Protein backbone atom coordinates (compact mmCIF):
# COMPACT_ATOMS: atom_id res chain seq x y z
CA UNK A 1 0.00 0.00 0.00
CA UNK A 2 2.62 2.54 1.10
CA UNK A 3 5.25 1.10 -1.27
CA UNK A 4 3.27 1.10 -4.52
CA UNK A 5 5.52 0.21 -7.44
CA UNK A 6 5.94 2.25 -10.62
CA UNK A 7 7.25 0.58 -13.80
CA UNK A 8 7.19 3.20 -16.55
CA UNK A 9 6.86 1.63 -20.01
CA UNK A 10 7.98 3.46 -23.14
CA UNK A 11 8.84 2.82 -26.79
CA UNK A 12 6.42 -0.07 -27.26
CA UNK A 13 3.05 -0.92 -28.80
CA UNK A 14 0.23 -1.07 -26.24
CA UNK A 15 -2.69 -3.35 -27.15
CA UNK A 16 -5.27 -2.81 -24.41
CA UNK A 17 -7.51 -5.53 -25.89
CA UNK A 18 -5.43 -8.13 -24.02
CA UNK A 19 -6.75 -6.88 -20.67
CA UNK A 20 -10.35 -7.72 -21.62
CA UNK A 21 -9.76 -11.47 -22.08
CA UNK A 22 -7.98 -11.68 -18.70
CA UNK A 23 -9.56 -12.24 -15.27
CA UNK A 24 -12.84 -10.32 -14.76
CA UNK A 25 -11.91 -6.65 -14.24
CA UNK A 26 -15.18 -5.19 -12.96
CA UNK A 27 -13.53 -1.91 -11.94
CA UNK A 28 -12.47 -0.56 -15.36
CA UNK A 29 -13.60 3.00 -14.63
CA UNK A 30 -11.44 5.07 -16.98
CA UNK A 31 -11.37 8.43 -15.20
CA UNK A 32 -9.85 9.94 -18.30
CA UNK A 33 -10.21 9.83 -22.07
CA UNK A 34 -12.06 6.61 -22.97
CA UNK A 35 -12.26 2.94 -21.91
CA UNK A 36 -13.18 1.57 -25.34
CA UNK A 37 -11.64 4.05 -27.81
CA UNK A 38 -8.13 3.53 -26.46
CA UNK A 39 -6.26 1.34 -28.97
CA UNK A 40 -6.27 4.09 -31.62
CA UNK A 41 -4.49 6.59 -29.38
CA UNK A 42 -0.78 7.36 -29.19
CA UNK A 43 0.71 8.24 -25.81
CA UNK A 44 3.93 9.97 -24.75
CA UNK A 45 4.75 8.54 -21.30
CA UNK A 46 2.52 6.02 -19.50
CA UNK A 47 3.20 5.37 -15.81
CA UNK A 48 1.70 2.10 -14.53
CA UNK A 49 1.42 1.78 -10.75
CA UNK A 50 0.27 -1.14 -8.61
CA UNK A 51 -1.03 -1.68 -5.08
CA UNK A 52 -3.41 -3.89 -3.09
CA UNK A 53 -6.28 -2.45 -1.05
CA UNK A 54 -9.56 -3.64 0.45
CA UNK A 55 -12.94 -3.78 -1.29
CA UNK A 56 -14.72 -0.72 0.10
CA UNK A 57 -11.62 1.42 -0.55
CA UNK A 58 -11.43 1.02 -4.34
CA UNK A 59 -13.84 3.95 -4.76
CA UNK A 60 -11.13 6.25 -3.32
CA UNK A 61 -8.78 5.74 -6.30
CA UNK A 62 -10.95 8.11 -8.29
CA UNK A 63 -9.46 11.59 -8.86
CA UNK A 64 -10.63 13.48 -5.79
CA UNK A 65 -11.95 11.61 -2.74
CA UNK A 66 -11.67 11.46 1.03
CA UNK A 67 -10.76 8.45 3.17
CA UNK A 68 -7.52 7.02 4.55
CA UNK A 69 -5.70 5.66 1.48
CA UNK A 70 -6.65 8.61 -0.77
CA UNK A 71 -5.12 11.10 1.70
CA UNK A 72 -2.11 9.37 3.31
CA UNK A 73 -1.24 6.35 1.12
CA UNK A 74 -1.91 7.06 -2.58
CA UNK A 75 -3.65 10.19 -3.86
CA UNK A 76 -4.38 10.99 -7.51
CA UNK A 77 -4.46 14.52 -8.97
CA UNK A 78 -7.72 16.15 -10.00
CA UNK A 79 -6.50 16.24 -13.63
CA UNK A 80 -5.66 12.52 -13.79
CA UNK A 81 -6.17 11.48 -17.42
CA UNK A 82 -5.91 7.71 -17.17
CA UNK A 83 -7.59 4.42 -16.25
CA UNK A 84 -7.78 2.60 -12.92
CA UNK A 85 -8.01 -1.20 -13.16
CA UNK A 86 -8.91 -3.35 -10.16
CA UNK A 87 -10.22 -6.86 -9.59
CA UNK A 88 -11.05 -9.11 -6.66
CA UNK A 89 -7.88 -10.96 -5.66
CA UNK A 90 -9.31 -13.03 -2.80
CA UNK A 91 -7.80 -16.23 -4.24
CA UNK A 92 -4.01 -15.88 -3.76
CA UNK A 93 -3.55 -12.80 -1.51
CA UNK A 94 -5.57 -14.29 1.36
CA UNK A 95 -4.70 -16.98 3.89
CA UNK A 96 -5.82 -18.53 7.17
CA UNK A 97 -5.70 -16.16 10.16
CA UNK A 98 -5.35 -13.22 7.76
CA UNK A 99 -2.44 -12.17 5.56
CA UNK A 100 0.04 -9.83 7.24
CA UNK A 101 2.21 -8.98 4.21
CA UNK A 102 0.24 -5.86 3.19
CA UNK A 103 0.71 -2.80 5.42
CA UNK A 104 -1.05 0.55 5.00
CA UNK A 105 -0.38 3.98 6.50
CA UNK A 106 -2.93 5.29 9.02
CA UNK A 107 -1.39 8.27 10.85
CA UNK A 108 0.40 11.20 9.22
CA UNK A 109 0.84 14.93 9.80
CA UNK A 110 -0.54 16.32 6.53
CA UNK A 111 -2.42 15.00 3.51
CA UNK A 112 -0.38 13.16 0.88
CA UNK A 113 0.50 15.37 -2.07
CA UNK A 114 -0.35 13.95 -5.53
CA UNK A 115 1.96 11.09 -6.56
CA UNK A 116 4.09 10.85 -3.42
CA UNK A 117 5.58 7.66 -1.98
CA UNK A 118 6.35 7.96 1.75
CA UNK A 119 8.76 5.13 2.55
CA UNK A 120 9.57 5.84 6.20
CA UNK A 121 8.98 4.45 9.70
CA UNK A 122 8.78 7.02 12.51
CA UNK A 123 6.50 7.03 15.55
CA UNK A 124 3.97 9.81 14.98
CA UNK A 125 4.17 12.14 17.98
CA UNK A 126 0.63 13.41 18.56
CA UNK A 127 1.14 16.05 21.24
CA UNK A 128 3.43 17.09 24.08
CA UNK A 129 5.32 13.94 25.17
CA UNK A 130 8.19 13.15 22.76
CA UNK A 131 8.93 9.46 22.30
CA UNK A 132 12.21 7.82 21.31
CA UNK A 133 11.61 4.11 20.71
CA UNK A 134 8.30 3.39 22.44
CA UNK A 135 4.63 4.02 21.65
CA UNK A 136 1.90 5.22 24.01
CA UNK A 137 -1.02 7.66 23.96
CA UNK A 138 0.53 10.25 21.62
CA UNK A 139 2.95 7.81 19.92
CA UNK A 140 2.02 4.87 17.70
CA UNK A 141 3.30 3.09 14.61
CA UNK A 142 1.67 4.74 11.55
CA UNK A 143 1.75 1.55 9.42
CA UNK A 144 -1.16 -0.72 10.29
CA UNK A 145 -1.48 -4.23 8.85
CA UNK A 146 -4.43 -5.39 6.76
CA UNK A 147 -6.36 -8.53 7.73
CA UNK A 148 -7.17 -10.38 4.49
CA UNK A 149 -9.09 -13.37 5.79
CA UNK A 150 -11.01 -15.67 3.42
CA UNK A 151 -14.08 -15.44 5.66
CA UNK A 152 -15.65 -12.01 5.09
CA UNK A 153 -17.92 -10.94 2.28
CA UNK A 154 -16.67 -8.73 -0.51
CA UNK A 155 -16.24 -5.53 1.47
CA UNK A 156 -12.69 -6.05 2.74
CA UNK A 157 -11.27 -8.71 0.40
CA UNK A 158 -7.90 -7.88 -1.20
CA UNK A 159 -8.22 -5.97 -4.46
CA UNK A 160 -5.19 -5.71 -6.74
CA UNK A 161 -5.37 -2.23 -8.27
CA UNK A 162 -3.23 -1.11 -11.21
CA UNK A 163 -3.53 2.53 -12.28
CA UNK A 164 -2.20 3.66 -15.67
CA UNK A 165 -1.29 7.36 -15.66
CA UNK A 166 -1.16 8.93 -19.12
CA UNK A 167 0.33 12.29 -20.11
CA UNK A 168 -1.13 13.14 -23.55
CA UNK A 169 0.92 16.29 -24.24
CA UNK A 170 2.83 17.82 -27.16
CA UNK A 171 5.84 15.51 -27.12
CA UNK A 172 7.30 12.77 -29.34
CA UNK A 173 4.95 9.85 -28.79
CA UNK A 174 6.51 6.55 -27.71
CA UNK A 175 3.57 4.32 -26.71
CA UNK A 176 1.06 4.00 -29.55
CA UNK A 177 -1.55 1.35 -30.25
CA UNK A 178 -1.92 -1.55 -32.69
CA UNK A 179 -3.26 0.67 -35.50
CA UNK A 180 -1.49 0.16 -38.82
CA UNK A 181 0.00 2.79 -41.13
CA UNK A 182 -0.69 3.89 -44.71
CA UNK A 183 1.11 5.69 -47.53
CA UNK A 184 1.65 9.45 -47.39
CA UNK A 185 -0.27 11.44 -50.01
CA UNK A 186 0.70 15.12 -50.03
CA UNK A 187 -1.12 17.01 -52.80
CA UNK A 188 -4.67 16.07 -51.84
CA UNK A 189 -7.19 17.24 -49.25
CA UNK A 190 -7.60 14.05 -47.20
CA UNK A 191 -8.15 12.95 -43.60
CA UNK A 192 -4.87 12.75 -41.68
CA UNK A 193 -4.18 11.24 -38.26
CA UNK A 194 -0.61 11.68 -36.99
CA UNK A 195 -0.13 10.37 -33.43
CA UNK A 196 -3.79 10.99 -32.61
CA UNK A 197 -4.04 14.49 -34.11
CA UNK A 198 -6.96 14.05 -36.51
CA UNK A 199 -8.30 16.49 -39.08
CA UNK A 200 -8.47 17.14 -42.82
CA UNK A 201 -6.49 19.32 -45.19
CA UNK A 202 -3.81 19.49 -47.85
CA UNK A 203 -0.30 18.47 -46.78
CA UNK A 204 2.64 20.20 -48.48
CA UNK A 205 6.39 20.21 -47.91
CA UNK A 206 6.93 23.28 -45.74
CA UNK A 207 10.10 25.38 -45.81
CA UNK A 208 9.82 26.05 -42.07
CA UNK A 209 13.03 25.81 -40.03
CA UNK A 210 11.82 23.21 -37.55
CA UNK A 211 14.29 22.57 -34.74
CA UNK A 212 15.36 18.94 -34.13
CA UNK A 213 13.52 18.91 -30.80
CA UNK A 214 10.31 20.43 -32.20
CA UNK A 215 7.54 18.27 -33.67
CA UNK A 216 4.33 20.32 -33.92
CA UNK A 217 3.78 23.85 -35.17
CA UNK A 218 0.99 26.30 -34.36
CA UNK A 219 -0.10 29.57 -35.95
CA UNK A 220 -1.39 32.65 -34.01
CA UNK A 221 -4.23 30.40 -32.79
CA UNK A 222 -4.05 27.01 -31.04
CA UNK A 223 -4.35 25.06 -34.30
CA UNK A 224 -1.69 22.69 -35.62
CA UNK A 225 -0.36 24.33 -38.78
CA UNK A 226 2.56 21.94 -39.34
CA UNK A 227 3.50 18.51 -38.00
CA UNK A 228 6.59 16.33 -38.45
CA UNK A 229 6.08 12.88 -39.94
CA UNK A 230 6.78 10.33 -37.16
CA UNK A 231 8.25 7.77 -39.60
CA UNK A 232 10.37 9.64 -42.17
CA UNK A 233 10.99 12.75 -40.01
CA UNK A 234 9.56 15.11 -42.62
CA UNK A 235 7.94 18.45 -41.82
CA UNK A 236 4.62 19.00 -43.61
CA UNK A 237 2.37 22.05 -43.61
CA UNK A 238 -1.31 21.53 -42.77
CA UNK A 239 -3.36 23.78 -45.02
CA UNK A 240 -7.16 23.53 -44.64
CA UNK A 241 -9.32 22.15 -47.43
CA UNK A 242 -10.89 24.36 -50.10
CA UNK A 243 -13.84 26.19 -48.52
CA UNK A 244 -15.63 29.49 -49.08
CA UNK A 245 -19.00 31.16 -49.32
CA UNK A 246 -21.70 30.71 -51.95
CA UNK A 247 -24.04 33.46 -53.18
CA UNK A 248 -27.02 33.02 -55.52
CA UNK A 249 -28.03 35.77 -57.94
CA UNK A 250 -31.78 35.49 -58.51
CA UNK A 251 -33.61 37.95 -60.80
CA UNK A 252 -36.92 36.84 -59.26
CA UNK A 253 -38.98 33.66 -59.29
CA UNK A 254 -41.84 35.46 -61.05
CA UNK A 255 -39.50 36.60 -63.83
CA UNK A 256 -37.55 33.40 -64.57
CA UNK A 257 -35.80 30.43 -62.96
CA UNK A 258 -32.23 31.10 -64.13
CA UNK A 259 -29.80 31.79 -61.29
CA UNK A 260 -26.11 32.65 -61.04
CA UNK A 261 -23.69 31.29 -58.44
CA UNK A 262 -20.98 33.46 -56.87
CA UNK A 263 -18.20 31.42 -55.25
CA UNK A 264 -16.57 33.87 -52.83
CA UNK A 265 -12.84 33.41 -52.34
CA UNK A 266 -12.18 31.40 -55.52
CA UNK A 267 -10.00 32.43 -58.46
CA UNK A 268 -12.15 30.47 -60.96
CA UNK A 269 -9.62 27.62 -60.70
CA UNK A 270 -10.62 25.78 -57.49
CA UNK A 271 -14.42 25.40 -57.68
CA UNK A 272 -20.05 31.42 -68.47
CA UNK A 273 -17.07 31.96 -66.15
CA UNK A 274 -15.92 35.43 -65.08
CA UNK A 275 -13.38 36.33 -62.39
CA UNK A 276 -14.17 39.36 -60.22
CA UNK A 277 -12.50 40.97 -57.22
Amino acid at each position, epitope marked *: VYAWNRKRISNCVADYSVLYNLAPFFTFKCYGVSPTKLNDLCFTNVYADSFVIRGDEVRQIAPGQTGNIADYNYKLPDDFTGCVIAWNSN*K*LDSK*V*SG*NYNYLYRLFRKSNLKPFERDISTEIYQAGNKPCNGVAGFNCYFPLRSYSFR*P*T*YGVGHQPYRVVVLSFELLHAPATVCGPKKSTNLVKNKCVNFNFNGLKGTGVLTESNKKFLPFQQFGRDIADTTDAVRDPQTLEILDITPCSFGGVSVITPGTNTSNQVAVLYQGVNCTEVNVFQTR
Partner: antibody, heavy 120, light 108 residues
Framework: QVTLRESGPTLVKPKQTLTLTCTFSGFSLSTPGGGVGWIRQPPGKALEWLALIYWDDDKRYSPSLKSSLTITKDTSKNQVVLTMTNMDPVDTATYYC????????????WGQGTLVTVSS | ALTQPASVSGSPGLSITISCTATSSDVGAYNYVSWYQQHPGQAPKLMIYDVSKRPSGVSNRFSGSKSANTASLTISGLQAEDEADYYCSSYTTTSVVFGGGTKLTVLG
Protein backbone atom coordinates in the same frame (compact mmCIF):
# COMPACT_ATOMS: atom_id res chain seq x y z
CA GLN B 1 0.35 -34.55 -12.57
CA VAL B 2 0.61 -33.72 -8.87
CA THR B 3 1.99 -36.69 -6.92
CA LEU B 4 1.90 -36.33 -3.12
CA ARG B 5 3.65 -39.27 -1.44
CA GLU B 6 4.29 -39.64 2.29
CA SER B 7 7.05 -41.40 4.22
CA GLY B 8 8.50 -41.73 7.71
CA PRO B 9 8.24 -44.37 10.44
CA THR B 10 4.66 -45.48 11.02
CA LEU B 11 5.39 -47.25 14.32
CA VAL B 12 7.28 -45.37 17.05
CA LYS B 13 7.48 -45.19 20.83
CA PRO B 14 4.78 -43.18 22.64
CA LYS B 15 5.44 -39.67 23.94
CA GLN B 16 7.91 -38.81 21.17
CA THR B 17 8.19 -36.56 18.10
CA LEU B 18 6.94 -37.74 14.71
CA THR B 19 8.90 -37.12 11.50
CA LEU B 20 6.19 -37.59 8.88
CA THR B 21 7.36 -36.06 5.59
CA CYS B 22 5.58 -35.27 2.33
CA THR B 23 7.62 -35.56 -0.88
CA PHE B 24 5.78 -33.52 -3.52
CA SER B 25 6.57 -33.72 -7.23
CA GLY B 26 4.92 -32.13 -10.25
CA PHE B 27 4.63 -28.50 -9.10
CA SER B 28 6.64 -25.66 -7.59
CA LEU B 29 5.78 -24.50 -4.07
CA SER B 30 6.90 -20.93 -4.86
CA THR B 31 3.73 -20.27 -6.88
CA PRO B 32 1.67 -17.38 -5.43
CA GLY B 33 -1.28 -18.84 -3.54
CA GLY B 34 0.07 -22.38 -3.22
CA GLY B 35 0.82 -24.43 -0.14
CA VAL B 36 0.93 -27.88 1.46
CA GLY B 37 -1.08 -28.77 4.56
CA TRP B 38 -1.89 -31.76 6.77
CA ILE B 39 -5.27 -33.37 7.48
CA ARG B 40 -5.99 -36.00 10.13
CA GLN B 41 -8.56 -38.78 9.74
CA PRO B 42 -9.23 -40.92 12.80
CA PRO B 43 -10.58 -44.43 12.15
CA GLY B 44 -14.34 -44.17 11.84
CA LYS B 45 -14.46 -40.39 12.28
CA ALA B 46 -14.35 -37.22 10.18
CA LEU B 47 -11.50 -35.12 8.82
CA GLU B 48 -9.73 -32.43 10.83
CA TRP B 49 -7.12 -29.87 9.79
CA LEU B 50 -3.81 -29.78 11.65
CA ALA B 51 -1.35 -27.41 9.95
CA LEU B 52 -0.70 -25.57 6.70
CA ILE B 53 2.32 -23.85 5.14
CA TYR B 54 2.47 -21.31 2.33
CA TRP B 55 4.86 -19.98 -0.33
CA ASP B 56 6.12 -17.09 1.84
CA ASP B 57 7.27 -19.16 4.85
CA ASP B 58 3.94 -18.52 6.61
CA LYS B 59 3.17 -21.33 9.07
CA ARG B 60 -0.50 -21.59 10.06
CA TYR B 61 -1.51 -24.14 12.69
CA SER B 62 -4.72 -25.28 14.32
CA PRO B 63 -5.85 -23.09 17.25
CA SER B 64 -6.32 -26.15 19.47
CA LEU B 65 -2.82 -27.59 18.87
CA LYS B 66 0.00 -25.03 18.74
CA SER B 67 2.59 -26.23 21.29
CA SER B 68 3.49 -29.40 19.35
CA LEU B 69 2.72 -28.86 15.65
CA THR B 70 5.88 -27.54 13.95
CA ILE B 71 5.95 -27.66 10.14
CA THR B 72 8.87 -26.69 7.92
CA LYS B 73 9.60 -26.48 4.19
CA ASP B 74 12.56 -27.95 2.30
CA THR B 75 11.85 -26.77 -1.25
CA SER B 76 15.56 -27.24 -1.99
CA LYS B 77 14.81 -30.98 -2.09
CA ASN B 78 10.99 -30.72 -2.36
CA GLN B 79 10.15 -32.48 0.91
CA VAL B 80 7.75 -30.86 3.38
CA VAL B 81 8.39 -32.15 6.91
CA LEU B 82 5.87 -32.17 9.77
CA THR B 83 6.87 -32.64 13.41
CA MET B 84 4.55 -33.01 16.41
CA THR B 85 5.45 -33.63 20.05
CA ASN B 86 3.64 -35.13 23.05
CA MET B 87 2.28 -38.20 21.27
CA ASP B 88 -0.78 -39.54 23.10
CA PRO B 89 -2.81 -42.71 22.34
CA VAL B 90 -5.59 -40.63 20.77
CA ASP B 91 -3.68 -39.37 17.73
CA THR B 92 -3.70 -42.77 15.97
CA ALA B 93 -5.00 -41.92 12.50
CA THR B 94 -4.19 -41.87 8.79
CA TYR B 95 -2.48 -38.57 7.97
CA TYR B 96 -2.74 -36.91 4.57
CA CYS B 97 -0.81 -34.01 3.03
CA UNK B 98 -2.81 -32.18 0.36
CA UNK B 99 -1.79 -29.27 -1.84
CA UNK B 100 -3.70 -26.01 -1.38
CA UNK B 101 -3.58 -24.59 -4.90
CA UNK B 102 -5.49 -21.43 -3.97
CA UNK B 103 -8.11 -20.08 -1.58
CA UNK B 104 -11.05 -21.20 -3.72
CA UNK B 105 -9.62 -24.72 -4.25
CA UNK B 106 -9.24 -26.06 -0.70
CA UNK B 107 -6.97 -29.14 -0.93
CA UNK B 108 -7.77 -30.26 -4.47
CA UNK B 109 -5.08 -32.96 -4.79
CA TRP B 110 -4.48 -35.29 -1.84
CA GLY B 111 -1.91 -37.96 -1.08
CA GLN B 112 -2.34 -41.64 -0.22
CA GLY B 113 -2.20 -41.78 3.58
CA THR B 114 0.04 -43.25 6.28
CA LEU B 115 -1.52 -44.83 9.37
CA VAL B 116 0.35 -44.07 12.60
CA THR B 117 -0.80 -46.50 15.29
CA VAL B 118 1.20 -45.76 18.44
CA SER B 119 -0.38 -46.39 21.83
CA SER B 120 1.65 -48.97 23.78
CA ALA C 1 -18.16 -26.39 12.94
CA LEU C 2 -20.32 -27.87 10.17
CA THR C 3 -23.03 -30.50 10.66
CA GLN C 4 -23.94 -33.10 8.04
CA PRO C 5 -26.60 -35.82 7.85
CA ALA C 6 -25.41 -39.20 9.11
CA SER C 7 -27.05 -41.51 6.56
CA VAL C 8 -28.62 -40.59 3.21
CA SER C 9 -30.58 -43.08 1.09
CA GLY C 10 -31.19 -42.87 -2.64
CA SER C 11 -32.76 -45.02 -5.33
CA PRO C 12 -30.60 -45.73 -8.42
CA GLY C 13 -31.40 -43.02 -10.96
CA LEU C 14 -32.94 -40.40 -8.65
CA SER C 15 -31.17 -37.41 -7.09
CA ILE C 16 -30.31 -36.78 -3.44
CA THR C 17 -29.04 -33.68 -1.66
CA ILE C 18 -26.72 -33.11 1.28
CA SER C 19 -26.92 -30.33 3.88
CA CYS C 20 -23.95 -28.33 5.19
CA THR C 21 -25.63 -26.15 7.82
CA ALA C 22 -24.23 -23.21 9.77
CA THR C 23 -24.00 -24.57 13.35
CA SER C 24 -22.82 -21.30 14.89
CA SER C 25 -21.23 -20.14 11.65
CA ASP C 26 -18.10 -18.19 12.46
CA VAL C 27 -17.28 -18.71 8.77
CA GLY C 28 -18.68 -15.25 8.00
CA ALA C 29 -20.04 -14.97 4.48
CA TYR C 30 -19.50 -18.70 3.76
CA ASN C 31 -17.96 -17.84 0.40
CA TYR C 32 -15.80 -20.90 -0.35
CA VAL C 33 -17.08 -24.43 0.30
CA SER C 34 -15.58 -27.61 -1.17
CA TRP C 35 -17.05 -31.12 -1.24
CA TYR C 36 -14.90 -34.26 -1.23
CA GLN C 37 -15.46 -37.97 -1.84
CA GLN C 38 -13.71 -40.75 0.10
CA HIS C 39 -14.36 -44.38 -0.80
CA PRO C 40 -13.57 -46.96 1.92
CA GLY C 41 -9.88 -47.73 1.50
CA GLN C 42 -8.85 -44.79 -0.71
CA ALA C 43 -7.88 -41.12 -0.39
CA PRO C 44 -10.40 -38.25 -0.42
CA LYS C 45 -10.55 -36.59 -3.84
CA LEU C 46 -12.12 -33.22 -4.58
CA MET C 47 -15.45 -33.42 -6.43
CA ILE C 48 -16.75 -29.83 -6.39
CA TYR C 49 -15.10 -26.66 -5.06
CA ASP C 50 -16.55 -23.14 -5.25
CA VAL C 51 -19.97 -24.67 -5.87
CA SER C 52 -20.69 -22.08 -8.57
CA LYS C 53 -17.92 -23.94 -10.47
CA ARG C 54 -16.60 -27.49 -10.74
CA PRO C 55 -13.08 -28.88 -11.22
CA SER C 56 -11.89 -30.60 -14.37
CA GLY C 57 -12.33 -34.36 -14.58
CA VAL C 58 -15.70 -34.50 -12.79
CA SER C 59 -18.89 -35.33 -14.68
CA ASN C 60 -21.94 -33.07 -14.75
CA ARG C 61 -23.70 -35.39 -12.27
CA PHE C 62 -22.27 -33.35 -9.38
CA SER C 63 -23.49 -29.82 -8.68
CA GLY C 64 -23.85 -27.56 -5.66
CA SER C 65 -25.28 -24.29 -4.41
CA LYS C 66 -25.86 -22.31 -1.21
CA SER C 67 -29.13 -20.40 -0.89
CA ALA C 68 -28.45 -18.36 2.26
CA ASN C 69 -26.11 -20.13 4.72
CA THR C 70 -26.38 -23.87 3.94
CA ALA C 71 -24.42 -25.51 1.13
CA SER C 72 -26.06 -28.43 -0.67
CA LEU C 73 -24.55 -31.11 -2.93
CA THR C 74 -26.94 -32.20 -5.68
CA ILE C 75 -25.89 -35.60 -7.06
CA SER C 76 -28.07 -36.65 -9.99
CA GLY C 77 -28.06 -40.05 -11.66
CA LEU C 78 -26.96 -42.29 -8.80
CA GLN C 79 -24.95 -45.39 -9.68
CA ALA C 80 -23.43 -48.33 -7.85
CA GLU C 81 -20.01 -46.62 -7.80
CA ASP C 82 -21.22 -43.69 -5.71
CA GLU C 83 -21.52 -45.05 -2.13
CA ALA C 84 -18.85 -42.98 -0.39
CA ASP C 85 -18.49 -40.48 2.44
CA TYR C 86 -18.78 -36.79 1.56
CA TYR C 87 -17.39 -33.83 3.51
CA CYS C 88 -18.02 -30.09 3.19
CA SER C 89 -15.07 -27.88 4.14
CA SER C 90 -14.87 -24.11 4.57
CA TYR C 91 -12.56 -21.44 6.02
CA THR C 92 -13.20 -20.43 9.62
CA THR C 93 -11.76 -17.31 11.25
CA THR C 94 -8.75 -19.23 12.61
CA SER C 95 -8.74 -22.70 10.98
CA VAL C 96 -10.12 -24.83 8.13
CA VAL C 97 -13.10 -26.87 9.31
CA PHE C 98 -13.96 -30.11 7.51
CA GLY C 99 -17.41 -30.74 8.98
CA GLY C 100 -18.90 -34.14 9.66
CA GLY C 101 -19.52 -37.19 7.52
CA THR C 102 -22.30 -38.35 5.19
CA LYS C 103 -22.64 -41.99 4.12
CA LEU C 104 -24.60 -42.64 0.92
CA THR C 105 -26.43 -45.98 0.76
CA VAL C 106 -27.78 -46.77 -2.72
CA LEU C 107 -30.40 -49.47 -2.18
CA GLY C 108 -32.02 -51.56 -4.92
Amino acid sequence: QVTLRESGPTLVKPKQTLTLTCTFSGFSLSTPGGGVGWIRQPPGKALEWLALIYWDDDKRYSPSLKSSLTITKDTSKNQVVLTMTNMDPVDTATYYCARLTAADTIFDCWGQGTLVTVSS
Amino acid sequence: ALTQPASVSGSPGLSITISCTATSSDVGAYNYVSWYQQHPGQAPKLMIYDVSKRPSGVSNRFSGSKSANTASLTISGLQAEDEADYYCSSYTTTSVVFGGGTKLTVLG
